[PDB]
Amino acid sequence: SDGSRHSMHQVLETVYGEVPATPAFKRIRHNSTTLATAINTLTSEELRPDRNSMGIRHGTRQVGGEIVSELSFESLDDTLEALMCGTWNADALVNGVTRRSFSILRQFNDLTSASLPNFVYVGCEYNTMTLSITTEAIVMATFGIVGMNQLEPSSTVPTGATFVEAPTTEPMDSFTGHVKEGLADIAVATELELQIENGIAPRYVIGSKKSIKQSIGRFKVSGTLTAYFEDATLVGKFLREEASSLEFVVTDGLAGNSYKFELPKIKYTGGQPDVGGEGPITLSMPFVAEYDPTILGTLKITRIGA
Amino acid sequence: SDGSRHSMHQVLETVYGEVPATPAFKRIRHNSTTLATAINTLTSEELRPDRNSMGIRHGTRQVGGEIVSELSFESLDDTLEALMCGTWNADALVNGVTRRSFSILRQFNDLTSASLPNFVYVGCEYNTMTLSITTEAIVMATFGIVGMNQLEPSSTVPTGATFVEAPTTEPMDSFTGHVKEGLADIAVATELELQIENGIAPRYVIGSKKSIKQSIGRFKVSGTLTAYFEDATLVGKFLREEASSLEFVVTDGLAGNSYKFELPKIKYTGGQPDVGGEGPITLSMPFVAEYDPTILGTLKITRIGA
Amino acid sequence: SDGSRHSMHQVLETVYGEVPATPAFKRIRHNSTTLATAINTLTSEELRPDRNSMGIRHGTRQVGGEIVSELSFESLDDTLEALMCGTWNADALVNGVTRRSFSILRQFNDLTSASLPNFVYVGCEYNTMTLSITTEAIVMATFGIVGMNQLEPSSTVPTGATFVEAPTTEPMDSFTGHVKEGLADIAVATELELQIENGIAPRYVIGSKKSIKQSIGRFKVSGTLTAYFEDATLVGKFLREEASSLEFVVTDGLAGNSYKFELPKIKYTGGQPDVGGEGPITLSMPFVAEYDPTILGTLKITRIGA
């Protein structure tokens, strides 16, 4: 099979670890994927006179895959909602406690029917998200999922596997960036990085070969902010304890639709200006987001889409 | 000295740690080497007002060297026999227990007589072996050895150091149409990797700068198999518990002489088809070999040489 | 700010952690520096029902700067004296105990006055030194320091910040015909590496954000010596316990002035002639220096400057 002809679809699960009766598989616009499963190994230490390798025994299997997707409007909304464990309300999303389990199907168009091109992964729950914003570079959102187990390859797709398509809105660009840092101050930051962690780990019991359930952890928001040393206001906020805020907006290709990420309470963990021989002096300022009561959360994503 | 004018000769030892009376040093066709000795250090911890470095003391020594050689017929047979710890029988070798110690002599041809070019190592025992098979790439067998101690450089070669030569048979290539994976199924694997370990470790006692003996460890045979995702049979064998077999034959060339490696019982530890950004989908399937009572061993090398 | 317009100065402190009344800031000849402070984080482990980020707390702070400078005469002299903890006597320096603290000032000429270009670092103490000598390559000396805390950026320089300029002499070259290894033997070594460690670690107490003092450790001198395998005398000094000496001099074109580094007692920790396929055979021979009572120290730097 080749990476050129591949299709990926997902459906919200009503019962954990099972595909719905008529799965509404939805197309997932993406670039590269590593979704797969991992099986444990129980080695045998039986003594052998000829030192012959005794062998190993298989163990519980867990689906683990990382998918890379470009940020765009009318897309990745379910992924963000499930990851934030919240609900899209008034085009605004806040980190809450609403876990969502999905069933992802990997269909290899190039693979023939007899070759079983359908690979179904169930119990898949979004766990980690990586957001990177670089000037003149498409904004991409990497997604890490925790799946309970995978089904055997089969020629026939899941019964009633309706394949919904994904709106192909122009990918978001880094221009017209509303990068705010103070109460009303606009920062001169060049790149911006955001990481989201749900801390979802699996739980195995006697007589099971998969994670009956996945233990979610605390919602964690952190990131890295890089700017130029030309601005000296960023310097000091790290030296002296100061709680600033972060607020940036990704721009579409003049489509009139856009998002808005806001971190009301953050504190700088680092920040060091280095001569670095010749050339302009940069400034990397990693930060740690913390719970803010005004929004009853740590992060708030808002769609201003037209 | 330069690597161009370099040669290595080895002789089977009758008494461990000693060169035989009339060593039949045999030429070892090789590419590069890292064979040498390592001496431990015993630091001294004593308080000093001037805070001056107290000093460290030399400890036990261990000869450790890695030798890279291209796989070819009528060559490396003694290395394979010694490593496998078995004995060549009917052009077939199965992992045994018989341990063989050798004495390796490094002779820098460019180095002058007064410059002491001869380097002698005693107690050298083959510990590990790395076999890599790549398409349109010569098959090379890497060899790791464990020696007791290195003899001081001298001008005169060991008394009666007869220098036997090695048959310069054409290096084994990868152009074979025989790579078996099932009972009669021929696999479409692209590269194949095999690793062998003897778990040999040295033993130290009071009043001995060198290792008197080496406690041999369990015989270990494992490997990695990479193929194309086009074949879907291998896919799923990782997910389910299945014990397959591996059987591949390196081809010397037009001459009928060839080597046959067989692993009667293996199981796959991993396996993952990744779409990636673009291009074809590959498939890496690591495996671990296990004891098969039919051959009363883990691996069986067979020469079909004409 | 850009790395093109930056000035770095320093002044000997009379009281630890404080800039002198009128600092005689002296130009620091260097290629690049990383002078900056680092603050620890105290995370809060309070369980939250909405699983929100509790937030972290700032902890103690310390200043670390990497001063990369090119070795040259009439320069880094105070740096060498402070690092060696000795006193320049008869143009000869021996590892002593007397500790020296300095106040480093980084001035970004390009940064405007209102932009607060002056950066002051107090309690800076030279700790590590890395000297590398390569043929047809300028001798470089890296300087690691341990500072107490970083003063806030201000427009006005420290009161009476007289800016002395270190004498600028042609950088030292590797073209010397004097590299001694035996009692009178001249070695054929190609590169030479020297590392100096003072073991300065910071000390924290209750109610102090900064380190009140630094408990210095013992003086540590070690290095690495690389040569060619053409000389077989170096071989064996590692195999059989032998205590040699090292003595090398850096040259300054036709200026005449020079530095002389001497290690009266060293022994070699490694040594390995590697064939490496083709080309010449090199020989890396790491060594550790120790206490020699003839000089009452480990290392003795001597200026023969005209």
Side-chain angles (χ1 to χ4, degrees):
Chain A
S1 175
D2 296 0
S4 59
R5 312 195 67 237
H6 170 243
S7 51
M8 229 183 199
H9 280 62
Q10 66 167 359
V11 50
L12 174 70
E13 293 175 345
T14 53
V15 172
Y16 181 71
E18 294 185 7
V19 181
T22 56
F25 280 118
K26 183 179 305 179
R27 185 159 64 67
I28 321 169
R29 306 163 58 182
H30 77 298
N31 296 36
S32 60
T33 175
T34 66
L35 172 60
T37 183
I39 301 182
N40 302 125
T41 58
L42 311 182
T43 171
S44 173
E45 295 81 1
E46 163 69 297
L47 175 70
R48 281 284 308 122
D50 214 299
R51 318 169 321 242
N52 271 300
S53 59
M54 260 289 319
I56 67 185
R57 283 279 300 220
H58 285 182
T60 64
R61 69 177 60 182
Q62 173 193 178
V63 155
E66 184 183 61
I67 317 174
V68 179
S69 176
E70 306 188 0
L71 182 64
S72 49
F73 200 65
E74 223 58 60
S75 61
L76 301 186
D77 255 357
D78 303 0
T79 300
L80 291 192
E81 192 186 61
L83 170 88
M84 269 276 238
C85 302
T87 301
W88 272 118
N89 169 313
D91 314 349
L93 179 66
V94 179
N95 48 299
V97 187
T98 317
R99 310 182 58 180
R100 295 177 179 62
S101 62
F102 283 67
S103 284
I104 304 187
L105 163 70
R106 298 188 60 180
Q107 183 171 0
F108 299 106
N109 316 302
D110 40 6
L111 273 201
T112 74
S113 60
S115 300
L116 313 188
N118 311 301
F119 292 64
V120 191
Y121 301 64
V122 298
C124 303
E125 299 194 299
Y126 298 118
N127 190 2
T128 60
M129 166 264 215
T130 299
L131 184 75
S132 179
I133 307 186
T134 311
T135 171
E136 293 180 358
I138 308 182
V139 181
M140 260 67 96
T142 311
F143 300 121
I145 76 182
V146 185
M148 170 165 96
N149 65 298
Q150 178 187 359
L151 309 188
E152 93 288 7
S154 173
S155 208
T156 287
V157 293
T159 301
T162 63
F163 298 122
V164 187
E165 302 302 298
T168 56
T169 64
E170 174 141 58
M172 301 286 207
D173 85 344
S174 298
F175 296 177
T176 324
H178 182 184
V179 181
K180 257 198 51 51
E181 181 272 337
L183 177 74
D185 230 334
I186 286 265
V188 68
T190 167
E191 292 48 40
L192 215 164
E193 161 87 29
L194 197 68
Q195 181 177 300
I196 290 183
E197 308 171 300
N198 299 358
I200 308 186
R203 314 193 306 240
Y204 309 117
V205 289
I206 305 297
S208 174
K209 207 66 163 179
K210 55 211 58 180
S211 59
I212 60 167
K213 283 300 176 178
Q214 305 173 2
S215 55
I216 192 174
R218 168 170 302 182
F219 199 114
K220 322 169 199 310
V221 185
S222 60
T224 308
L225 180 88
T226 66
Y228 279 178
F229 181 55
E230 175 186 300
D231 190 2
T233 48
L234 285 194
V235 183
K237 293 161 181 163
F238 156 60
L239 278 81
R240 61 196 172 181
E241 174 49 64
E242 280 287 0
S244 301
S245 62
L246 216 43
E247 161 181 348
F248 55 99
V249 176
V250 290
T251 308
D252 204 298
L254 300 190
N257 43 62
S258 62
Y259 288 122
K260 161 144 202 200
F261 314 80
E262 185 164 2
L263 296 91
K265 203 179 299 175
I266 67 170
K267 55 168 46 189
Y268 288 119
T269 283
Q272 165 189 59
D274 279 356
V275 185
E278 308 286 357
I281 303 180
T282 183
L283 189 74
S284 179
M285 288 210 76
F287 60 104
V288 173
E290 38 192 301
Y291 166 63
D292 189 294
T294 316
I295 72 165
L296 311 173
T298 309
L299 182 72
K300 178 178 183 180
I301 313 178
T302 301
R303 319 173 278 193
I304 321 87
Chain B
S1 163
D2 292 0
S4 60
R5 313 202 68 237
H6 180 243
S7 61
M8 257 185 206
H9 278 62
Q10 65 167 359
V11 50
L12 174 70
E13 293 175 345
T14 53
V15 172
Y16 181 71
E18 294 185 7
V19 181
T22 56
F25 280 118
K26 183 180 305 179
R27 184 159 64 67
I28 320 168
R29 306 163 58 182
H30 76 298
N31 296 36
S32 51
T33 175
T34 66
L35 168 66
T37 186
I39 305 181
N40 307 120
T41 65
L42 311 182
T43 204
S44 180
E45 188 70 4
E46 172 173 358
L47 296 192
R48 260 304 174 181
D50 204 3
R51 310 173 312 181
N52 261 300
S53 174
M54 269 293 318
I56 86 182
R57 283 279 300 220
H58 270 176
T60 58
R61 56 178 55 181
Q62 178 180 179
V63 159
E66 190 174 61
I67 309 178
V68 178
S69 177
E70 306 189 0
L71 183 61
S72 54
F73 206 68
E74 227 56 60
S75 60
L76 301 187
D77 254 357
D78 302 0
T79 302
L80 292 191
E81 189 182 60
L83 170 88
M84 269 276 233
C85 302
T87 303
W88 273 116
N89 169 313
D91 314 349
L93 179 66
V94 178
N95 42 298
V97 182
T98 65
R99 299 178 61 181
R100 303 172 182 62
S101 62
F102 283 67
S103 282
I104 301 189
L105 168 68
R106 299 187 56 179
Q107 198 161 0
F108 312 113
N109 312 301
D110 39 4
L111 256 212
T112 81
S113 61
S115 300
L116 316 175
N118 328 294
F119 276 39
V120 200
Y121 304 73
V122 299
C124 304
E125 305 197 304
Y126 297 118
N127 192 305
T128 54
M129 170 265 212
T130 297
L131 185 75
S132 179
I133 306 188
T134 311
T135 171
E136 293 180 358
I138 308 182
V139 179
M140 260 67 95
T142 313
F143 303 121
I145 76 178
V146 177
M148 164 171 95
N149 83 299
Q150 169 182 358
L151 301 196
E152 84 287 357
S154 174
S155 208
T156 287
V157 293
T159 301
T162 64
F163 298 122
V164 187
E165 302 302 298
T168 60
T169 63
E170 171 172 57
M172 296 270 171
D173 71 1
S174 305
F175 303 168
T176 202
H178 165 208
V179 174
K180 280 200 33 69
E181 181 272 338
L183 177 74
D185 230 334
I186 286 265
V188 68
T190 167
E191 292 48 40
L192 215 164
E193 161 87 29
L194 197 68
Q195 184 177 300
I196 302 179
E197 304 171 300
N198 300 0
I200 279 190
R203 282 210 318 232
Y204 299 129
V205 287
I206 305 297
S208 175
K209 220 70 162 180
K210 52 217 71 162
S211 69
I212 70 161
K213 288 298 173 182
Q214 290 116 340
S215 57
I216 185 178
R218 186 176 191 118
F219 205 64
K220 322 175 198 310
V221 177
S222 61
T224 308
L225 180 88
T226 66
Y228 279 178
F229 180 55
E230 175 186 299
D231 188 3
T233 62
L234 286 191
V235 190
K237 289 174 182 166
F238 152 61
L239 281 83
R240 60 196 173 180
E241 165 54 64
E242 280 287 0
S244 301
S245 62
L246 216 43
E247 161 181 348
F248 55 99
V249 165
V250 285
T251 304
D252 189 297
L254 293 91
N257 35 61
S258 61
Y259 278 95
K260 161 144 202 200
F261 314 80
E262 185 164 2
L263 296 91
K265 230 179 311 173
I266 68 173
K267 46 173 62 173
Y268 303 141
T269 283
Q272 174 185 57
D274 278 357
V275 166
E278 255 287 358
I281 304 181
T282 184
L283 189 74
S284 179
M285 288 210 76
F287 60 98
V288 193
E290 50 204 60
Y291 189 9
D292 190 300
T294 316
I295 72 163
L296 286 189
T298 299
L299 179 74
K300 178 178 183 180
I301 313 178
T302 301
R303 319 173 278 193
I304 320 87
Chain C
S1 176
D2 296 0
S4 60
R5 312 194 64 238
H6 170 246
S7 51
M8 169 187 212
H9 280 59
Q10 70 168 359
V11 50
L12 175 70
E13 293 175 345
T14 53
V15 172
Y16 181 71
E18 294 185 7
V19 181
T22 57
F25 278 119
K26 181 183 305 177
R27 158 200 172 120
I28 305 185
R29 304 172 55 183
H30 79 301
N31 309 60
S32 60
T33 185
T34 71
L35 244 314
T37 187
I39 306 181
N40 308 120
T41 65
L42 311 182
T43 204
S44 180
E45 203 56 20
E46 173 174 359
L47 298 193
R48 288 185 54 63
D50 202 4
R51 316 165 312 181
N52 302 306
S53 303
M54 260 294 314
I56 68 186
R57 283 279 300 220
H58 270 176
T60 58
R61 57 147 50 183
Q62 56 178 240
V63 166
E66 176 191 60
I67 316 177
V68 179
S69 177
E70 298 182 0
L71 181 67
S72 53
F73 197 66
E74 218 56 59
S75 61
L76 305 182
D77 251 14
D78 305 1
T79 318
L80 278 194
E81 191 183 62
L83 170 89
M84 270 276 238
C85 301
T87 302
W88 273 118
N89 169 313
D91 314 349
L93 179 66
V94 179
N95 45 299
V97 177
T98 66
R99 301 179 61 181
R100 301 172 184 61
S101 62
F102 284 66
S103 284
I104 294 189
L105 169 73
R106 279 181 58 179
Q107 193 166 0
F108 310 111
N109 319 301
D110 41 5
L111 276 200
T112 74
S113 62
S115 300
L116 316 175
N118 328 294
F119 276 39
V120 197
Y121 311 102
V122 296
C124 306
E125 296 199 301
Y126 296 118
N127 189 3
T128 60
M129 192 265 260
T130 305
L131 190 81
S132 179
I133 305 187
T134 311
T135 171
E136 293 180 358
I138 297 184
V139 179
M140 254 65 94
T142 306
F143 300 119
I145 79 176
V146 184
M148 165 171 95
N149 79 299
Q150 165 179 358
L151 302 197
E152 83 287 357
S154 174
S155 208
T156 287
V157 294
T159 301
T162 70
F163 296 122
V164 190
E165 302 306 300
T168 58
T169 65
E170 172 144 57
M172 301 286 207
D173 85 344
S174 298
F175 303 168
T176 202
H178 165 208
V179 174
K180 280 200 33 68
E181 181 272 337
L183 177 74
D185 230 334
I186 286 265
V188 68
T190 167
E191 292 48 40
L192 215 164
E193 161 87 29
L194 197 68
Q195 181 178 300
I196 293 182
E197 308 171 300
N198 299 358
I200 312 185
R203 282 210 318 232
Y204 299 129
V205 287
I206 305 297
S208 175
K209 220 70 162 180
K210 52 217 71 162
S211 69
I212 70 161
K213 288 298 173 182
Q214 290 116 340
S215 56
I216 191 176
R218 84 184 58 119
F219 206 113
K220 322 168 190 299
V221 179
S222 61
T224 308
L225 179 88
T226 66
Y228 278 173
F229 178 57
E230 192 174 300
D231 196 7
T233 48
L234 285 194
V235 183
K237 293 162 181 164
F238 154 61
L239 279 80
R240 60 196 173 181
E241 173 50 64
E242 280 287 0
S244 301
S245 62
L246 216 43
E247 161 181 348
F248 55 99
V249 177
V250 291
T251 306
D252 192 0
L254 291 90
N257 43 48
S258 74
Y259 278 95
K260 161 144 202 200
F261 314 80
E262 185 164 2
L263 296 91
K265 230 180 311 173
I266 68 173
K267 45 173 62 173
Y268 303 141
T269 283
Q272 194 196 75
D274 249 354
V275 161
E278 281 305 10
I281 307 172
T282 178
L283 189 74
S284 179
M285 288 210 76
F287 60 98
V288 193
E290 56 188 61
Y291 190 3
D292 189 300
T294 316
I295 72 165
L296 311 173
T298 311
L299 169 71
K300 178 178 183 180
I301 313 178
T302 301
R303 319 173 278 193
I304 320 87

